[PDB]
Structures are given as structure tokens and as C-alpha cells.
Amino acid sequence: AINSVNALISRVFVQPKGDLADRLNSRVTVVILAVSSALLLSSHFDPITCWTPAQFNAQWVNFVNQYCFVHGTYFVPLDQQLAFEEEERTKVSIQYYQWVPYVFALQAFLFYIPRFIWKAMIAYSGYDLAAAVKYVDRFWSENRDKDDKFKTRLAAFEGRPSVYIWDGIRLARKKRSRNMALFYTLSTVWQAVNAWIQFYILTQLLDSSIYTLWGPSILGDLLQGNDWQTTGHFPRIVHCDFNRRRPASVQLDTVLCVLTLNIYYEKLFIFLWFWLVFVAVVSTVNCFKWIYYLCNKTKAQKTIKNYLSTAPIKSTISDDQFFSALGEDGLFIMDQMALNLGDIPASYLTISMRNICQDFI
Amino acid sequence: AINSVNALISRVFVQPKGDLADRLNSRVTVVILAVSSALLLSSHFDPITCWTPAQFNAQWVNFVNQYCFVHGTYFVPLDQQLAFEEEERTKVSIQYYQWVPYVFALQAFLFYIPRFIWKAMIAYSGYDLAAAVKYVDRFWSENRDKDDKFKTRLAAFEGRPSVYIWDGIRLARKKRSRNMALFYTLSTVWQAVNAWIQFYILTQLLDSSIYTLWGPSILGDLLQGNDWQTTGHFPRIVHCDFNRRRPASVQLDTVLCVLTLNIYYEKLFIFLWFWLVFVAVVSTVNCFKWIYYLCNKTKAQKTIKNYLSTAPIKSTISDDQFFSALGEDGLFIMDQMALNLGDIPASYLTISMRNICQDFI
Amino acid sequence: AINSVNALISRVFVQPKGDLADRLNSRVTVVILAVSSALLLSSHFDPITCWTPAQFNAQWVNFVNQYCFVHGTYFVPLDQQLAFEEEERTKVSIQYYQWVPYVFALQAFLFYIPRFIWKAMIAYSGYDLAAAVKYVDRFWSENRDKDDKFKTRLAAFEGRPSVYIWDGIRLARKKRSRNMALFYTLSTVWQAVNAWIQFYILTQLLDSSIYTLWGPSILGDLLQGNDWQTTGHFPRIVHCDFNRRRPASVQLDTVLCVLTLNIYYEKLFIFLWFWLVFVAVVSTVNCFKWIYYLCNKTKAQKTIKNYLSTAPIKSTISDDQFFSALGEDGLFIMDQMALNLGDIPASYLTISMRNICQDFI
Amino acid sequence: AINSVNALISRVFVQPKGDLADRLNSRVTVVILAVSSALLLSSHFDPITCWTPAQFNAQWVNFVNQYCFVHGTYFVPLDQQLAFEEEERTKVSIQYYQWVPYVFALQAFLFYIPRFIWKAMIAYSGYDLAAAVKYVDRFWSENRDKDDKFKTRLAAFEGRPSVYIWDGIRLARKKRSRNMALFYTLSTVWQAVNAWIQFYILTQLLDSSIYTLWGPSILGDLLQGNDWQTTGHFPRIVHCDFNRRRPASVQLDTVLCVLTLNIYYEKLFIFLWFWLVFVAVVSTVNCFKWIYYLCNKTKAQKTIKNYLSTAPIKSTISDDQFFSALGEDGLFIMDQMALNLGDIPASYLTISMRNICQDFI
Amino acid sequence: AINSVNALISRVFVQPKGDLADRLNSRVTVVILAVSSALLLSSHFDPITCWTPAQFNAQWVNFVNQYCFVHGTYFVPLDQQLAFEEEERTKVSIQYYQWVPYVFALQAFLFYIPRFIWKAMIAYSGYDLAAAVKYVDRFWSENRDKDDKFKTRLAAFEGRPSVYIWDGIRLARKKRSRNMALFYTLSTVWQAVNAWIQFYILTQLLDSSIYTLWGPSILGDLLQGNDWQTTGHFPRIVHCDFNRRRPASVQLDTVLCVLTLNIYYEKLFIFLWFWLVFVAVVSTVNCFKWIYYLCNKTKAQKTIKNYLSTAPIKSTISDDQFFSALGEDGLFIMDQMALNLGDIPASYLTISMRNICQDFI
């Protein structure tokens, strides 16, 4: 059959509204890992097929099938005979079927957490950016078109939106926010550390006792033409111990089982390793951006002092004390308005807020 | 069954808005290679069928089927007997089933990257073309029809849109853009090099040790009537080594397996080679266009100096110093407006911007 | 099952807007050949059934089925025995299964190319007919109904649309178009040559070594009652060589296989030959029309000089010098407006353009 | 399963707009023959079942099934033994499975051609009736309701629609139409001859060597209770020659096969013969109508001279010379307006055109 | 499975607009007989099952199944032995499977013809009732609600609708209609005779040689408890002659086949006989209504002379000569307006037409 779900993918992939730069790799990460996880445990609707001997009546084949899938499997390159005891034969032991498809779902969830941390944390800060942005937005969606306001366009932002934002600041500033920028940079630290932990989980996945995977080694093998049977690891043909019961208890034998899933798993561990290390390095530089921002803060004002330089007629109020009134809170939320509404609609907003800021400072 | 997906193909094939010339062969390339890849690994919902001997009970047939698919296969033209050892029989060894259907998906993704590079890079440059184009666009969609503005049509562009664009330039020009044209031509260099690398991946695909494919050789064979068995390569009937286990370990035999997929794969490697070399040569000339543009730049102004020659009443301001004010940034974004909105609506825009450009120069 | 796709057929069959006369046989050709191709390789969801002898266990039947389909088949009229060697038996050898269903898809694509050549070429010429036609169109869709403009109807075309068209000509005429008519007639030459090449591909299809098909011979046989077995070619019952492997290598035998597809293929090669030769002869006369047009050009003006003869009040400007101003470019685009908008709405447009043409000549 | 397609049947059955009287039996003919054809080759999703002897293993049953379907079948009434040689047994030979379901599709197409001839031919004539009719139509759809125009209703047709039609005549009359009526009557001759040829194809279908079908003979048999086995023709139980291969080559035997399709085919050849002869005789009288029209032409004016007799106030212009101005072209297009818009809305149009016709004559 | 088609049943069952009294039993008749016919030949997706003896291998069971269905079957009450020869055993011979399900479809079509006769015939008469009724209808749908016209309501019908109808009469009366009432009563004669012929076809169906069916006999048996086996006719268990072929030719035997369809067929021949005789007697009285109408015609005017008796203020014009002007044509179309629009909206129309009728008489 075929399964194509457009809508549910569009829910996370689209619906929640933000343009946040490359923080939307949480949005797409959840989709990739969620779809891969839900696809693998779907078993491509036979995971494993086996050689079980002549006289089994085919209700046992459908048994030794699972009993090989559930109980572990192992591998030996072939011609070593079987070795002996339980050890040298079981030395290389490949069962990651138990982990991978579920631990991916867990991965995806742990990529979704940081957004939740940011929503709950901004609701803790007291000043909601979602409402403000969606407001000044549609203010800019209405009268951008209307020709009645252009020569007035500057004075239009003065009354209606700028009093809304500048009014929200008065309420928030009395409740648990001068700090909301700090809360944001903690959110992005959590983003980075989360990414690296996920990557490390990919590495330590499979089993650390038998190697570990990271891409340029595997591609540095395949592209040398080492396949599997001559590379000594990661096989597609696995022997399977097997146990009946009689008054002689164990009665174990070895039945080799061709193994399909191992053709997918290491075709997508070459991709998904590159893509997770990419999400890691693009998420970790975004963090140092904001520690730099939070630290220097004298060059955090370059964008605002830049917008105030266009400033038709440049009326009166001085520069510094405007930052004295706006400094802790608004200096951030402006860096948010520029990121969503665009650039030019923000400059009008921050040049209007300079005119009406008196009573507060 | 039948699978027909119109919508998801229309998402990439349509939804993101641009007319960029023959840069939309990334758009269609992703569709061709993505659909081919997703179709091949669908196995036309039997990949390979085999001759396995008389006494197997049909749970082994369904085994030696995979065990032949997963483990490699090879070919010998027939009547050579089997030769001997492991080598002369395995000399020509055909397994590209492992690579092709997945490496196509990887291809498609690597065709989608350059668009991403251009979006992220223009967001780095500071001046967003998407917003501007979509703005002056619907400005031209509203009052193109309205009869109240025609004798005023020139003066209409003066106030409303031209102040928007010409205002965006003031903001961008202070932040990391005189260069956005250079960023664009780097994007197109990446486009070309990406295309040629993809083509080279097609060539080196299959296995370089046993020939390599490029079209006029294969068609230069088929159209001479060499099929396969007499051309010595690329078969549809492949022998398959096979291994049981007993106290005598290997016990290998040879069971020839009729092989269906090889009827598709080299029907679409004749097409897809031509089509990739075409995308290559149409993408590589588009690049030299922009290096020429970026270099000479005295003949990059021919279109603007051309629009200013229609110029009703040709009021006052001289020619050169207009380019002195507009030169680095706007000279590009105009070449973008002409490409999307059409030609005649752009000439009005660039003849209006000449009138209101004073304060900035 | 049943597959009925209305929408995707309506996309090519309808969506792209033009009335171009019998150039829409590219539009319908792509549909016929695409649907036939996609239907044939669907195998009418058994291509071939065979007689394979008594003791095969039905996993071999499902093998010799393909091994007969993939490896070639041949035919002998029956009672000749088998002849001998490999030659006299294989003299008539029927395998076109490999070619036909795919080479049809290739056909269809090569019918779609010329439209692409025309779009890209008109975008090279500098003056876009699509925008202009869709503009003066909906200008004629709005105020055709409105009763306020009829006595003014002539003066209505004067201001709004005619300045748009006549303004586009000023821009184009400075960039790489006096020639757009020539580009068009090259497009139609490509149309004709493309058609004849496709037809010749039908002929040389099957195999030229064993006859070739063209309709009045086949119908000139069937309607004489020659079927197949007595006509010596084109059978529905084909013998199939077959090869096992043992220490005696070849072990070939002959197993006759009833062959279904051959009932479809030559029911639609009687139709599709007629229909391609029709598309050829209707496409090739359309070409000589435009070479005649491009050559004489004194009788290319008959339609315009005809429209200017209705001409209420026939004000002032002389005849010839109007053509001197309009000659190279507009004389074409008018022959385009007449073809899409209809006839009477074009006459108003070309009688209005005579009034406002002064400044340009 | 069940297949019900409403929309595609509604496309031809409805969408193209015309009321043309009983020329819409092309419209419905295409539907009947197309649906019958597509239903028969669907095989009622077993065409033929057979008696094949005891020891065949059921992969041969599924062979001799086709090999009987593809290779011909014959019939003998039973108890004649088998006769002998190849002739007396094969005398009556029933295979129309090869022809019927496809030749119906061909029929349907050849019913659709004449409409195409009429569209292309009217586009050759220079004056498009589709646009005009759809125009004066919605002119009559708008202000039929509006109460502001009734006492003015006559004067309403004077300005807006009548100048449109009467203006189109000026353009057409200069290009290849005084004749469009003649083109129409050639179209209807083609209609009639096409119908009779189709009917004759039904007759000569099956095989002329063994009888031929026309209804009152078959019903004149069935309703006498002659079924098949006693009527000597048209059986439901057919013997089937069959050929193996051994060192004795032919080895033919006779295996009688119950035959289902023959229960449908002559249930719908009783219907479809009546219905085609009806379409023939209703289409052939429609033709003599228009040859009469084109010939006498003094009584072709009875409808117009009839409309001019209601004529409130009957102002001035004489009768004959109005026909002198309108005679060749408009006299037809009026007989078209009466057929689509109805009758009363046409009389207003032709009584208005008498008032404004001066300048043209 | 399940098949439920609402829309196609709603097309005939609803879409064509008329209230014609009990002439809509053609509308519902077509649905009943069409659905029954299409359901029966669907075989309730096994028509007949049979006892065929022990040693048949189940590819013969699936043969003797059809060979019993196609070739006839017969019946004997049981214990008579088999009798002898071919006659006494085959005396009662039940095969109506061949006829019934198709002859029902033919029935339905022959119920649909009379509507077609009426549409074509009214289009022959020259005055189209469909347009008029649908016009004065929506005239009554608009201003019935509007409160501005009530005291004016009488004068409202005077200008707008009544001039439309009374104007159509002037055109029609000059072309082939004083007679349209006569055409209508011929249509209803055809309706009645058609109904009785259909009923007689039900009777003579099955086979007249073995009884015939009409309801009160069958129910007069079942409700006496005569079932089948003791009533001597109409069985559910039928013996089936059967023929192999050997050098002894016939080799016929008798294999009794349980027969399911016979449980449906005479459950719905009890219903459908009553329902057809009802449609007959309700359709035949509707006919004598109109012969009475057409004949006396002095009491055909009772409804109009009745409406003119309400007549506010009863202005001037006498009674009889109004009928002299309206007599042949309008006297009918009024009896049509009363049947569709209702009664009270018609009285206003016929009291308005009395006021404005002067010029015509």
C-alpha cells in the first residue's frame, strides 16, 4: 500500500507562526526523525527471513522467524566454521532492532522540548511577543496598501501600534522582566546542548562495545569498496541461535537468516549523521551569537542607533537617554520585530517610539 | 494498485514564487529524481526471480530470493561454462541495486541545496527581494485595471511604491550590502558546480571498475542492435552464488535468476543522462552570464540607461550621478524586478526613481 | 481495478491558455501518447502465458514466464517443424516489448519540446505576448458588458489598452526584437520537422530488418482477411527458446507461449499511424503558411489594411507610414490578438492605435 | 467491483454549449458507443471457459483458456460428429472478439469528427457564432429581469447588441464569408454520409462470409423461438482447435469451450442496430432540410419576413433591400440565434437590426 | 460489497423541472425498472450452483456451472423418474435468465421515450412552454416577497410578464400552432398505449407456451400455500442436461442444480405486476381527461371563466371575444401555468391578460 500524510506534516511544518532563523531546524528535525521512526517500525508494509530446515511445517517457520527477530542475532565472516562455546561465535552481536525505531521517536520529542521551554518561559517573563508581533503585523498588513497614509505613514505608527507596544512595556517592566533577553539566551543554550546530546546518542547508538558510527569512516570504507563481509562489521546475513525444549533442555542450533532491514538502517545512518552534525553546528553558532549579544551590549545597540540615523527631520530627543528608557526590555523585542515583520516596517516603529517617549523617562 | 499524487508535486513544482529563468530546473530536477527514486524502491508494487532447484519447499524459494538480492550477483555470456575459482566467474559483477534508488534521493536533495543557499544568503545581505517584489507586484495588480490612474500612471509609481523600494535601500545600504550582486553570482557558481558534480556522480555510478555509462555509447550500441548478451555488459540474466551451512561449511552453488529491474534502470539511464547534461549546460551558461555582468558592469547598465531613454518629458537630473546613487545595490534589484513583474511595469518604476532621487545624492 | 484521472489530463489538456490553431495538437498528442504509454507498461492490471511442461512445480512456471518475456521470442508458421541450428528458427524474431511502451513516453516528451522552445524564445525576444493578450483580454471582458461605453467604445480602447500595447512596443523595439515573427516561424519549422521525425520513428519501430509498418498495407491485409498465421508476420503465438544449466551447459528447449499484448499493440498501431500522419500533414501546412507570410509580407498586411477600411470617420493619418511605424513588431502581435481575443475586439484595437501613433513616427 | 463515472460522461454529454437540434445525437452517440466499447473490453470485471481434459494441472487450463480465446473458435450443431479435414468443421467460424470492442471505439471517434469539422470550418469562415450567441445571450440574461427596460426593451436591443452583431458582419463579409451557410450544409452532408457509413460498418461487421446482421431478421427469429442451436448460427457453445508440439508436430484436438460474451454481444446488437438506423434516418432528413434551404432561398426568408410583421409602429425602411444588405451572411446567423436564445428574443433582435441598417446599404 | 448511487438517481428523479401530474410516473418508472435491471444482471455481487458428480476436479465444476446456466434448464416434480426421450422430461422448460434482466432495461427506455416525444413535439409547435413557465415563475419568485408591490400587485403582472407571454403568442400563432393542445393529447395517447404495451410484455414474458403470469393468480396460489413443487410450475430446483464429447458423440446426463435467482425473480414479479398495472390505469385515465378536454371545449373554459369572476373592479372588455383572441393557443398554456406556478399566481396572470388584450383583437 501507500501512506501519504500531507496535513499532519503541515501542522508542525507550517502552522505555528515564526520566522526564527534556523531555530526552524527543530521544526524540520521533528519531521525527519518522526517520519523515519514511524516508517521503520512500519516494517515497510518482512523484516527478517530465515533458512529454517527441511521438515518444519510452516507454522514453525512463522515461529523461528520471530524467535530469531526477538532473541538476538550475531555474525561471523564466512569461512571460519562456527568456532565453539557461546563466546567466539557471539563476539560480534548485532541487535539494534530493539532500540533504533523507538529511540528515534524519543529523539524527535527531545528536539521538540526547547520550543516548549521558550513558550513557557516567555509566559513566565510577563510580556508576550506572540500577541505583539501578530498585532503590529496586521497593522502593517492593513494600511501598507491604503494610499491615504504615506505622507502620514510615519505619523500612523505613532498613535495606533506604538502606544500598544510601548504600553505593554509598562506592564511587563513591573513584573519579572528586565531579563527576558537572558531567558532567551538560556533557551538557545538549551538548544545547543540538546543538539550535541542528540548527536552523541547517535554515536553511542548501535553498541559501543562493537565499534561506533561516524560518517567519514563509513563512507571512507564503502567508497573504498569494503561492503560488509570483508569489513568485518555491519552484516546483512546473520546467524541465529535457536532453542527447542526436550528432556535434554537447550538443544540449540544455528540457522542463518537473511536480514533486510540492515539495508535501510545504514543507508540512512550515513545521511542522518551528516544532517545531525549540521543541525548541531548551525545551532551552536546561533548560541554564541546571543552570548556575544548579551555580553557586549554596546554593539547590541548598533541596529537601533542605525535605524535612528534615517529619521526624517530628526526632531529633538537625545540618543542615549532613549536607550535609558528602552534599554533592558524593548531593545530585545525590537530585535524580534525586525526578524518577523521584516526590516523596513520595524524602522518606522522604532523611529516612532522615539517621538512619544517622554512620560516614561 | 495506482499512486497519483498531484498536490505534493505541486508544492515544490508551483508554490514557492519566482520566475527565475531556468533556475527552475532545480525545481523540476528535484521532482524528476525524487519521483524516480521513490518509484524504484517501490519495486513496482517482484524485483528478482530465480530458478532454485526442484526439491525446495517454497519457504526456501522465498529465502534464496532475498539471499540472491542482498548478496551480490554476477554475469557470464553463455556458453563459457562456469570457469573456476571465485574470480573469472565473478569478473563482471553487477550489483547496483544497493546504490541507485537511494543515491537518487541524495541527488535530489543536493539539487535543492542551492535555493536554500540563496534564501539564507539574501537574508544575510539585509535586503529582502521577496517582500519588495511581492509588494510592487500587487501594487501593479491593483491599479493596472483602475482607469482613474493612467495620465497619472507615471505619477502613481512616484509616491507609493518607489518610496518603499528607495526607502529599503537606505536601510540595507548601511548593513552588509553593497555586495548582494556578488552573493548572487556566488550562488550561481554553486549552482553550476553542483550540476557538474551530480552529472559526474551519474557517470561514476554503477561501478567504475566495470566500464561506466554515458549516453551516446549506449545508444551507439543499442541502435546498432547489440542488446546485452552480445555486448558483454549490462545483463538481464544473472547467475547467483549461494551458500548453505553444514559441517562442510561453504557448500556454494550457482542458481541463475531472471532479473527484472535491469529493464527499467537502463531505460531511464538513457533519458536521465541526456537530461542531466542538459541541466548542466543550461546552468553553466547562466553562470558566465553573471560573471560577465559582475565584471564589465559598464554594459550591465545598458538596460537601465535603455529604460531612461523612453522617459516622457525627460525632466532634469543628469544620467551618471543617478547611477552614482543607485549603483551597487539597486542596479541589481531592478534586474530582479524586470524578471518577475515583467518589463513594462519595471520601466515605470525606474523612471520614477529618477525623479525622487535627490536627498540621497 | 479502474484508474480514471480527470485532473492531471485537464492540466495539460486545458490549463495553459492559448487558442493557437492546431498547435494544440501538441497538447492533445502528449495526452494520447502519454496515456497509451502509461497504459501499456501497466500490463492491463498477464502479459504472456506459456505452455511449460508437466513436471514443473509452479515456481518455475512463474520463472519461465519472465525468462521468456525478457529474453527474446520468435515465430514460425505452423507446420514447418523447428528447422535447425539457431538461425532458420529465429529468422522472424518478434521482441518489441522492450521498446514500445517507453519509446512512446519519449515520443510524447519530444512533442512537448516545441512549446518550450516558443516560450523561452519569446522571453528571449523581449516582448511577452502572454501578458499583453491576457491584459487587453480582460479589458475586453470588463467593459464589453458595461453600457456606459459604446458610443465611447472606440475612444475607450484609445486611452487604456492601446497605450499599454503601444508602450510595450517602445521597450521591446530597443532590445532584440524586430525579428519576433522570424523566431515564430522557426518555432513552427521545428514543429513540422519534429512531427515528421516522430512519424519516421513509428515506421522504423518494431525492427526494420523484419518489414516495417504503415497503415494501408496492414489494413490492406486484415481487410483482405489475412489475419496473422497466413500473413507470415506479426503473430500472437510465439515459440520461446529456454536454457537451464547443468554440467552440459546450454540445454535449450522450445516452449510455445501464448502472447496477449500483441492483440493491443497492432490494434493501436493502425490508429496511431493514421493519427500521427494527420498531425504531420496538418502541422506541415501551418508551417508553409508562415514562410509565405514571412516572405511576401505585402499580402501579410491584408488583414490590417482590411481593418482600417471599416474605420468610422477615417480621420487623418495616412496608410503606409502607419505600417512604417508598426511594421516589424506590431504587425505580428496583431495577428496574435486576432487569434485569441477574437476578431471584432481586435479591429477596435488596431483602429485605435492608428489615432494615437504620432510621437513614435 | 463497480465503476460509475458521472463527470467524464457529463463533459461531452453537457459542457460544450449548443442546442443544435438532433445534432446532439452525435453527443449521445459518442457516449453510448464509447461506454459500450470500454465496458466490453473490460470483460465484465471470465470471457471464455473451457472443458480441457482430466490430467491438465491448472497452469495449462489457464493456458488453453487464452490459446482458445486468441486463436479462433468455430461451431457445429450437435449431433454431426466432427466431420473431417480442416474445412467442414471450420465452415462456420465465429471470432468477432478481435474486432468488436475496439472497432466500437473507432466508431465513436468517427461520430465525433463532424463537430470538429464544423468548428474548424466556422473558424475558417471568419465569423464566429459561438462568441456572438454567447454574447447576445447574456445580454438577454441581464436585462430580461430588469424592469427599467420594457417600454424601452425594443430600443435596448438597438444600441448595445445589435451594433455588436451588425458590426461583426462588416468584418466577416470582407473575409471569405458570403458562404458560411454553404459550409454548414456541407457539414451536415458529412453528418449524414458519416452516419450511413457507420451503419454499414455494423452490417458488414461480424463476417460477411457467414451471414450478416440486421435487426428484424434476428428478432424475426428469436421471437419465433429459434434460439441458436437450431438456427445454425451465432452460438454460445463453441469447439476450439488446439495444438501442442512434439516430434509429431501438430497434435491438434478439439475441446469445447462455453462462451459467455456471446450472451451480451447479440443482446446489444439488437438494440444498437435499431438505434443506429434511427440516428441515420433522423440525421439524413436534417440534411435535406438544409439543401432545400440553400436551394430555394425564397422560402428561406419566411421566418425573417415573419418576424418583421409583428414590428411595432413599422417605421420606414422597405422590406426587400433589407434582405439585400443582410442576405448572404446574417440571414443564416439569425436562424442560429433563433435556435439557441429561443424565439422571442430573436424577433426583437431582427426588428432592431432593421432600424439601424442604413450606412451599410 | 455495497453500491449506493444517490446522484445519478437524483438526476432523472429530480433535475428536469416539471410538476406534471402523474406523468412523473414515467420519471419513477425509469428508476424502478432501471435499478431492478442493473441489479439483477449484477448477480447480487453465485447465480446457480450444481451437484456435479464426485470425480470432477473443480475446473469442470466451474465449467458445468456456466454450461448449465447458458444452455437451458428444465424441471420435473419429484418422484416421476426422468421419463424418456428428449420431450416429456423437457416439457416444462424454465429459462428466462436470457431475457429478463436486459428486457427490463429495454422496458425502462421505452418508458422514457414519451417525454422525448413531448419535448421534440413542443419544439415543433413553435412556442416553448419551458422558457415561459420558468420566466413567469421567477417573476413570481422575486416580487412575491417585496412589499412595495401588493396594492400594485395586479398592475405588476400587467406590464412585465403578461407582455412577455402575450408577445410569444403573436410569434407562435404565425408558425404551426393553433394546435399545440392536440399535439399534447397525442403525446398522452402515446403515453397510455405505451403503458399497456409494457404491461402486455410483462405478461407474455417468461414463455407463453408454459402458462403466463398475472398477480392475483400467483398470490391466489402462494397464499393458499402451494409453494412451487406442488404447483407444478416455477421451480427453484432444476435438472440440467449436459453433454461431453467422445467418439460416442452426445453422452448426455442429468445433473440437478440448485437455482437461486428464482427466489428473487418471482418475489419482484408479484410487486412489479401490480405496480405496472397501476401505472397503466393511472396513465389511461389521464388520457381520457384530455380527449374529453379537446372534444367538448365548452367546459374546457370553465377554469378561465372562473378566474375572471374574481376580477377586482371588472373593468370593461367583454367575455367571449377575449376567448376569441386567446382561444386556440393560450387557453392551453394557461392550463400549464396553473399546473406549475400554482393556482393563485395564475389567476393574476389571466386577469391581467384581459386588460391589455385590445390590439390583437
CA distances to B328, C37, C196, E305, E356 from C34, rounded to whole Å, are: 49, 5, 18, 69, 65
- CA–CA min distance D90, chain E (Å): 17
The residues, any chain, with a CB within 8 Å of residue A87's CB and separated by 6 or more, are none
CA distance C51 to chain B (A): 17
Query: Which residues in chain C have their CB less than 8 angstroms from residue D59's CB?
Result: 52, 58, 61
Taking CA E31 as the corner, what is the angle to CA E27 and CA E36, rounded to the nearest 5 degrees?
Answer: 155
Return d(Cα D282, Cα C103) in angstroms, integer: 45
Q: 3-class SS at C33?
A: helix
Residue positions counted in chain B: 361
Nearest to C8 among B6, B54, B343 (CB): B6
Is the minimum CB–CB distance between D33 and chain E shorter than 8 Å?
A: no
Closest by Cβ to D245, choosing from C144, C256, C267:
C256
What residues of B are in contact with residue A144 (Cβ under 8 Å)? 135
Residue D211 falls in which region: left (phi positive, over 0), alpha (psi -120 to 50) or beta: left
Whether the CB of C205 is below 8 Å from some CB of chain D: the reply is: no
* B106-138 as b/e: b if 16+ CB within 10 A: bbbebbbebbeebeeebeebbbbbebbbebbbe
Q: Distance (Å) from the C-alpha of residue A317 to the closest C-alpha of chain B?
A: 21
Q: Does B316 touch chain C (CB under 8 A)?
A: no
How many helices (H) and strands (E) chain E has is answered by 13, 5
Do chains C and E have 3 or more beta-carbon pairs under 8 angstroms? no
> Quick one: CA dihedral C31, C32, C35, C37, positive or negative?
negative
Q: With contact defined as beta carbons under 8 Å apart, do C346 and C152 qualify?
A: no
For E172: left if phi > 0, alpha if psi spans -120 to 50, otherwise beta; the answer is alpha
Name the residue facing D59 among C61, C256, C310 (closest C-beta): C61
Task: Give the three-state DSSP class for E241.
Answer: strand
Q: What share of chain E is helix, strand, coil (3-state, %, to 5)?
A: 55, 5, 40
* Closest CA in chain B for residue A143: B160
Tell me the three cell numbers of residue A203: 554515536
Select from E66, E135, E168 the Cβ nearest to the Cβ of D258.
E66
Q: How far is E109 from chain D (nearest CA, A)?
A: 11
Which DSSP state fits B237?
E
Would you call B305 an interface residue with chain A, using a CB distance cutoff of 8 Å? no
Quick one: which of A350, A330, A310, A348 has its CA closest to A140? Answer: A348
What was the elucidation method?
cryo-EM
Rounded-to-integer distance, Cα A321 and Cα E298, Å: 105
- How many Å lie between the alpha carbon of A299 and the closest alpha carbon of chain B? 14
- From C81, C237, C267, residue closest to D71, measured CB to CB: C237
In Å, what is the CA distance from C164 to each residue of C323, C324, C356? 19, 20, 12
CA distance B119 to B131: 12
Give me the amino acid identity at C327: G
Are the CB atoms for C236 and D66 separated by under 8 Å?
no
Listed by number, the residues of chain A in 3-22 with a beta carbon closer than 8 Å to a beta carbon of chain B are 4, 6, 21
Question: Residue A255 carries which side chain, given as an amino acid letter?
Answer: V
CB < 8 Å & 24+ apart, contacts of D266-271: D266/D213, D266/D218, D266/D234, D267/E102, D268/D36, D269/D202, D269/D213, D269/D218, D270/D215, D270/D218, D270/D219, D271/E106
Q: In what order do the strands lie in the sheet with B257-259?
A: B48-50, B257-259, B237-238
| Residue B13 φ/ψ, nearest 5 degrees | -65, -20
**B174 to chain C nearest CA, in Å?**
34
Count of C-D CB contacts under 8 Å: 72
Contact C168 B343 (CB under 8 A): yes
- On whether any CB of chain C is under 8 Å from the CB of B256, the answer is yes
Cα–chain-centroid distance for residue C142? 35
Cα-Cα end-to-end distance for chain C: 68
Cell 437451458, located at residue: E72
Shortest Cα–Cα distance, B298 to chain A (Å): 30
Q: Which long-range contacts (CB under 8 A, 24 or more apart) does C1-4 make?
A: C1/B1, C1/B2, C1/C45, C1/D1, C2/D1, C2/D3, C3/B2, C3/C42, C4/D5, C4/D8
* CB neighbour list of residue B357: distance below 8 Å, 6 or more residues apart: B166, B317, B322, B325, B326
Torsion-angle region of residue D311: left (phi > 0), alpha (psi -120 to 50) or beta?
left
**Chains E and A are in contact, defined as 3 or more C-beta pairs closer than 8 angstroms:** no
Nearest CA in chain D to C44: D42
Chain E CB contacts of D282 below 8 Å: none
> Distance between CA atoms of E38 and E361, rounded to whole angstroms?
57
Residue B237: strand pairing partners: B258
Whether C57 has its CB under 8 Å from any CB of chain D: the answer is no
Does E252 reach chain D within 8 Å, measured CB to CB?
Answer: no
DSSP 8-state assignment for residue A12:
H
Q: What does the DSSP assignment read for A177-232?
A: -S-HHHHHHHHHHHHHHHHHHHHHHHHH-SBTTB----HHHHHHHHTTT-TTTTTS
Amino acid at C20: L
**Euclidean distance between CA atoms E126 and D305, whole angstroms:** 16
Looking up cell 511595469, which residue turns up?
Answer: B345
CB C139 within 8 A of CB C171: no
Q: Are the beta carbons of B70 and A236 separated by less than 8 Å?
A: yes
Q: Which amino acid is at C240?
A: C
Which residue of chain D is at minimal alpha-carbon distance from E141? D145
- Nearest chain D Cα to E8, which residue? D6
Size of interface D-E (CB pairs under 8 A): 72
- Interface check for C246 against chain B (CB to CB < 8 A): the answer is no
Single-letter residue type at E218 = I
Which of B7, B160, B167 is closest, CB to CB, to A6? B7
Å between B138 CA and nearest CA of chain A: 9
Is E151 exposed, middle or buried, given 0-12, 13-18 or 19+ CB atoms closer than 10 A?
Answer: exposed
For chain D, say whether C306 makes contact (Cβ under 8 Å).
yes
> First CA to last CA across chain A, in angstroms?
68
Q: Is E in contact with B (3 or more beta carbon pairs below 8 Å)?
A: no
Distance from CA of D166 to the nearest CA of E (A): 23
Q: Is C263 on the interface with D (CB under 8 A)?
A: yes
- Asked if A49 lies within 8 A of B66 by C-beta distance, the reply is yes
Q: Do chains D and B touch (3 or more CB pairs under 8 A)?
A: no
Q: Which residue of A has its CA nearest to B106?
A: A271
Q: What residue of B is the nearest CA neighbor of A53?
A: B60
Closest CA of chain D from C96, distance in Å: 19
Q: Which chains touch C (3 or more CB pairs under 8 A)?
A: B, D
Q: Tell me, what amino acid is at D70?
A: V
Residue pair A239/B72 in contact by the 8 Å Cβ criterion = no
A148 touches chain B (CB under 8 A): no
Resolution in Å equals 3.3
Torsion sign over Cα D119, D125, D126, D132: negative
Tell whether D149 is within 8 A of chain C (Cβ): no
Contact in structure between D149 and D158 (CB atoms under 8 Å): no
| Other C-beta atoms lying within 10 Å of the C-beta of residue C300 | 18
Element (H, E) at B238: strand B237-238
Chain breaks of chain E after residues with C–N above 2.5 Å? 45
Rounded to whole angstroms, the Cα distance separating A178 from A125 reads 9
**CA A87 to chain centroid:** 40
Breaks (C-N over 2.5 A) in chain D follow: 45
Strands D237-238 and D48-50, by their bridges, are: unpaired
Residue C26 · residue C11 · CB < 8 Å:
no
In this complex, is the C-beta atom of C271 within 8 Å of any C-beta atom belonging to chain D?
yes
- CB–CB contact C310 D171 (8 Å): yes
Q: What single-letter amino acid sits at C112?
A: Y
3 state SS of E252: strand
Of the candidates B57, B62, B171, the beta carbon closest to that of A344 is on B171
**C315 to chain B, minimum CA–CA distance in Å?**
23
HSE-CB at C326 with a 13 A cutoff on CA atoms is 27
Burial call A171-196: b when 16+ CB within 10 Å, e when fewer: ebbeeebeebbebbbbbbbbbbebbb
Helix (H, G, I), strand (E, B) or coil at D84: coil
DSSP class of E82:
T
CA angle D143, D147, D152 (to 5 degrees): 75
D237/E174 Cβ within 8 A: no
How many other C-beta atoms are found inside a 10 Å radius of the C-beta of residue B88? 12
E77 within 8 A of D269, measured Cβ to Cβ: no
Q: How many CB pairs under 8 A join B and C?
A: 72
